[PDB]
Structures are given as structure tokens and as C-alpha cells.
Amino acid sequence: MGKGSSKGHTPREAKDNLKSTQLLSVIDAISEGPIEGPVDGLKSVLLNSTPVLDTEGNTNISGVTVVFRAGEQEQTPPEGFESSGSETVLGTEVKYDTPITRTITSANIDRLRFTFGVQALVETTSKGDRNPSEVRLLVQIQRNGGWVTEKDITIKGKTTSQYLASVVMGNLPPRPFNIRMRRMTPDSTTDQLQNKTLWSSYTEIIDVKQCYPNTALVGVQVDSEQFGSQQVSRNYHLRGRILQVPS
Amino acid sequence: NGKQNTYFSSLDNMVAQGNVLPVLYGEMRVGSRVVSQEISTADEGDGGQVVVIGR
Amino acid sequence: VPEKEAIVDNGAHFDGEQSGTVNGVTPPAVQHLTAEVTADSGEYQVLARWDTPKVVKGVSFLLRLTVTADDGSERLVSTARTTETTYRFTQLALGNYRL
Amino acid sequence: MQDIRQETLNECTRAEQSASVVLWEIDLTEVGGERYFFCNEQNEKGEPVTWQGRQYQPYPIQGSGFELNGKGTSTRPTLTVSNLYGMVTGMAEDMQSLVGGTVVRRKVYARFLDAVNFVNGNSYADPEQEVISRWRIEQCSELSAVSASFVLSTPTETDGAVFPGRIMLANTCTWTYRGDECGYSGPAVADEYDQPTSDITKDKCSKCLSGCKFRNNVGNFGGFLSINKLSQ
Ligand code: SF4
């Protein structure tokens, strides 16, 4: 699936009832200089002792984001890995009428993380038997003048107290920036429908700048929930160096 | 216990400080020298536009 | 060659942060700790949820649940060590619980 | 079987053979010196020996320990030269005791030498007839008021070398400044103490992270700025 770069990306299973997902982000160091790469592909990434992709092509493990880097001198840093972040809290209600906007206008940003959420999602009825509310929110970028919708999120759950999520975008244009988040569900007209939303904070991420010039890194970024409390023993069935072999 | 090790294989993720990178010559299944390891909270969504937190 | 001496005690320009990166891989405080007292199952239960911060090489969590006494003091009710990001408490008597 | 011409093998098998002269050359160009040509003997006209158009000056010099062997230590020859009148001394105080220089040794039958060296001329002169060997100077073992002695070594000599060589480090760069791996080509910025300078002769990297940042080369930093905490 490539030479000198790779993406992997077997998909993650959609959740059932909210919950957070712990992530395990590692970067390994193998070989020196240009190398051939994996023998097969995602079938040569043994997360603990099993390949991510079954020999028939099925996915053994869900949530794998291998990004292979050869040892070529001209490389790029592994995308998706953070080195430092700065979080600004603006926890306020988001209504249909009034969006927020903050005009980050930062200097050395690389990716933007939004921390939205719902105060409570219950929908009370006669007696009891509360039900989910299924709210929808929208995250939009400045994008010159056109308020392009970067993300549109639907939240479906019952809950009783505050629940917060997070979402990351990149490819940020120059920075006279103006980010925004707005609501789609009209409002909580009746006291029996509690579907208030909130925008707690946003984070500026600087990411990894060091494109390790002559090593073979791999990087995984696998959700560690499926594995237990024991460590994950990454193994790689790779090929070796590219030699200066006689013509 | 009785395991026999060689000088040309490693299936373990070794510490990567003052330890030389390594050298691999063709094929083989290899361990690594861990450069980074970070357990954190993932952020919902993969790509595109449509994201649903829970179903 | 005595003139060697003056060259030795001229160590290079180390970057800084002699305090030890002001973190010492000490895990940051866990964020978004929410406790939910629910009774839809027929009895009072408490579901606690939180989010793991960015912590090196792995993480576990220590939970300490106490109850405020009548005089304002605290009574150590329970302790736990877990790896999941959710916990559930049952059979809790009335009181003001600090988790 | 050494690539040596047929005339040399013809001369080797003769019962009565000509004298076998050895001509030495010391090459210090790679270390900062010149090339000196020496022969232990003059010719019949009392002049430095002319071989292939080059004059090898008369000077007492001879070597020993020359052999071709694979089992055991790499062979270390030894070259003894005269230090009367303080010639080698002058080179020892000048060229870091000649360490790192190249010693080239040629074996030539006197029958094949240039016609200049002989009063009656040499109709058999053949400047292609020679056996060449190369060595390096490892240590000037002795240097007295009388003579000097040098230890020679094969140019390979994997004695102090290690493999693999590149080492994982934090807060330090293992690249060579302005080298291919470093990839830097910008103007003078700072010296090894991170002091801002515009002088090209005082422009060296401190090998720390700040030194890399001074040149906007952090992407090419040779260190690994995460490993200090995983080794705890
Ligand atoms: S720190 Fe940066 S500029 Fe200095 S030698 Fe290393 S790669 Fe080059």
C-alpha cells in the first residue's frame, strides 16, 4: 500500500452508549536508512501476538491507525501525534439564536480540538420512563467568508449529568481565524425535555515537528480499551534495508 | 529459564535511550526501540463531516 | 600542557529546565469527573465517569469515596484501584458523599 | 595471485637475479602535508634513484613485519627511518606526529629501473614493473636523536570501530553540522554557546535543541525529544 509512507486505518466500531475511549499512541524505531517496508501490509502488524488483519482479509482488531515511515532522508513527521497543547475554556450555552465565535487568531497552531457536550439529555414523560433526546450541533470554520461546516454531530443518549466530547480538525488556513459552533435542535420549550448543549473549551495543538530523518518509525494509535490492563506488545513483520546491490 | 537468545533477533520492545537504533537486513519479524508512548483520550470522529456520538 | 585546564571547565550550553521539566511524568488531574445518582433500576446507584488525561506509558485510577459526618468530618467509606474510566457504587446509605 | 606482470615473474625464477629495490612514499596530503619519496640507496652515479620519472631521495629507511595473513590480529608492519639532523622531528611537531598518513611501498627489480640511474643505460627499463602496497601510520612508536620508528596498519583495521554506530539521545544531536543528514545550509547564526553571531568562522551548532531552533532545523534534529521520560 506504499513505499516510504503508509496509512493503515482499519475502522473503529461505533459505540452503543456514549462513554470515552482511551487511546494508546506509540512510535517505534526500527532499522536505519531506507527500508522496504511491511511484508504484506496491515497483516504484518501484530498488536499483541495477532495480526490486525486476518489472513483472509477480515479485521481482527478494530481501531488501528498504523502510519509507517521508511528511513528515507527526505521524510515527513508522523501525522496525528501531539507534542503540546493549550486549552482555553469558554463553557457557555449554545442556542439556536446565538452562536459563540472566539477568533483564535493564534500563531503556531497545527490542529484544532473542540470540547463540546450536553448538560443533560433526559426526556421526562408522565410518571417516569425517560427517553433519549437526539440533539444535533454544528462546528464551522471561518474559511475566508463562507462559513464552511467542518463537522456536524448528532448525540443520542439518555444521561442525567454533564457529558462532554471532543473533535479534531486540521488543514487550518492562515490565521485571521473565526471558529464557530451552533445548534440545530430548536430549544427546550417544555420542562420535560432537557436537551441543553454546551461548548466547554477548545484546544490548540502544535503536533510533532521532528521528521526523524533516517529511522523507520511505525506509530500505531490503537484504542486500548479492547486490551486489558496489560501492556500492548507491538511486533512488526517487516522487510529490511534497501541495499546498494550490483547492477 | 531456558530460552536461547541470538545476536541477530529481538522480539521485545526495548528502551530507546543510549542504545543504538538497530540494523535489519531483509525479512524478519522485529521488536522495536520505543520512541514515544502516550495513553490519552481519543476524540470522536474519523473524517469527512458526519459524526454521531452514540446510537 | 597546563592551558588545557581552562578549556575543561567551560561546559556547553544546556537547554534549561533544571527542575526536571516541571512535570516529572506526574499524571495530570483526571478531567470531567461526573457522578450520577440514578434509580431507574429500582434502587439507588451511583455511576461515576471521567476522562483519562495524557499520561505516559499507561494509567490506572485510585478512587476514594468518603461521607461527610454530622460534625463536618469525613468517614472513609471505600477505596478502589481500577483501569476502566467508569465505576458503579451500590448499597450506599444516606449522606453527602465526596468522591 | 597478485596482479604482477610477466616480466617480474620471469625475473623471479632466474638463478642469478638483479637487486630488488624498495621505494617508499609518505603521503600526508589527507592530513595536511606533502609527499616525500625515499630510497635506502643511491644509484651508480651518486644521485637519488629515478623511478618512473620521479626522484626518490637517498635516506636510510627500512621496514619489517610485512605479511599477508587473515587468522588472528591484523598485521602491523613497522618502518624505521633515520632521525639524524632532525627531519622526522620537524614533521612530528608539524603534522601531529604523522599520524593518519599513508605509506606506499614499491618493490622493483633494479633491472627494470629507468635508464637514467645507470651509466651505460638500461635497454630493459620498463616503468610498469612494480609491486605496490599501501598502509597507514598508526603511531610514531619511537623518536630519538638517532632514529624514528612508525607502526603501520592496514587501512581497514576495525579496531576501535563499533556497529551499529548511531546512538539514541535526548537533548543532543548526533548529526554532523552542515552535513548531509543535518541538511543545513543557511548563513551564520550562532556559535556552540548559542550566542548570536554573524561570523562564518564562529558559526557552529551547540548540538542542543536551542541550537537547532536557531537555524529553524528542528525537523532535522538528530535527537529524539521524547526518550528521556520513557527510560525512567
Ligand atoms: S542540531 Fe540541527 S542544525 Fe545543529 S547539527 Fe543537529 S540537525 Fe544540524
XYZ file of C-alpha atoms in Angstrom, chain A residues 9-11 13 40-45 50-64:
25
model
C -6.602 2.641 9.172
C -8.824 -0.267 9.892
C -12.071 1.310 11.137
C -16.585 0.041 15.853
C 2.180 -7.834 3.439
C 0.553 -4.694 4.847
C -1.808 -4.454 7.802
C -1.499 -8.247 8.066
C 2.099 -7.727 9.257
C 1.300 -5.624 12.348
C -2.140 -11.446 16.313
C -2.149 -9.544 13.015
C -4.582 -6.661 12.745
C -5.974 -8.095 9.500
C -6.850 -11.786 9.401
C -5.167 -13.821 6.666
C -8.478 -13.881 4.758
C -8.693 -10.071 4.872
C -11.008 -9.739 7.871
C -10.182 -7.240 10.610
C -9.068 -8.908 13.838
C -8.633 -5.668 15.807
C -10.689 -2.502 15.328
C -9.230 0.966 15.828
C -5.758 0.657 14.301
